[PDB]
């Protein structure tokens, strides 16, 4: 008798459960609600070789390997299977210290992903994660500024656009420095 809930899904994001969108927010962990049955039940999530899973709550945590294997058997010996292959998008910010477009691009794109089309892509991508504006989350970075495309006018200023989500929104003219925010990796 295996019964799992699929209305509240916990996405690799920051532990948010609602509808499955298309992006992961954080290391790489998701949790689904599935419960065994009467006796022997088997749980597998992303596979132990790559992720740590919670057997009393479909909790899968992956962060580097390739695909994720998740299966669920009812305590009565029923069989369920779910493997990550197409979906499972992941965003990765690269900049433990202030960074430049080229230094971060080598690292971010080295991830096989690409940069956002504009400042809003990151702010909207992060605002969807709930970190760009979690208030207390600022404690991880009171001010988080990302590198953005420059404007025709600011480019001539010899600068690029800078985005600050929790410190004041996006800003323009940043490049004369050579590393004022960081690179973002999506997908």
Catalogue all structural domains in the chain, each as residue range(s) with its CATH number: 1-90 (2.60.40.1080), 91-187 (3.10.100.10)
SS (H, E, C) the chain: CCEEEEEEEEECCCCEEECCCCCCECCCEEEEEEECCCCECCEECCCCCCCEEECCCEEEECCCCCCEEEEECCCECCCEEEEECCCCCCEEEECCCCCCHHHHHHHHHHCCCECCCCHHHHHHHHHHHCCCCCHHHHHHCCCCEEEECCCHHHHHCCCEEEEECCCCEEEEEECCCCCCCCEEEEC
Place of tokens 């979906």: 87
10 Å CB burial of residue 21 (0-12, 13-18, 19+) is: middle
12 and 29 in contact (C-beta within 8 Å)? yes
**Solved how?**
NMR
């Amino acid at each position: 008798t295996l019964t799992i809930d699929d209305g509240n899904i916990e996405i690799v994001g920051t532990g948010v459960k609602g509808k499955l969108p298309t992006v992961w927010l954080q290391y790489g962990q998701v949790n689904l609600k599935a419960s065994g049955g009467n006796g022997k039940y088997t749980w597998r999530s992303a596979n132990p070789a790559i992720a740590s899973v919670d057997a009393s709550s479909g909790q899968v945590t992956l962060k580097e390997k390739g695909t994720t294997t998740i299966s669920v058997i009812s305590s009565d010996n029923q069989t369920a299977t779910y493997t990550i292959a197409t979906p499972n998008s992941l965003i990765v910010p690269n900049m433990s210290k202030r960074v430049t477009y080229n230094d971060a691009v080598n690292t971010c794109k080295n991830f096989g992903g690409k940069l956002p089309s504009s400042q809003n892509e990151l702010e909207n991508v992060f605002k969807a994660w709930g970190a760009a504006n979690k208030y207390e989350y600022y404690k991880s970075s009171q001010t988080i500024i990302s590198w953005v495309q420059q404007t025709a006018q600011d480019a001539k200023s010899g600068v690029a656009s800078t985005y600050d989500l929790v410190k004041q929104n996006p800003l323009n003219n940043i490049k004369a420095s050579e590393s004022n925010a960081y690179a973002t990796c999506v997908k």
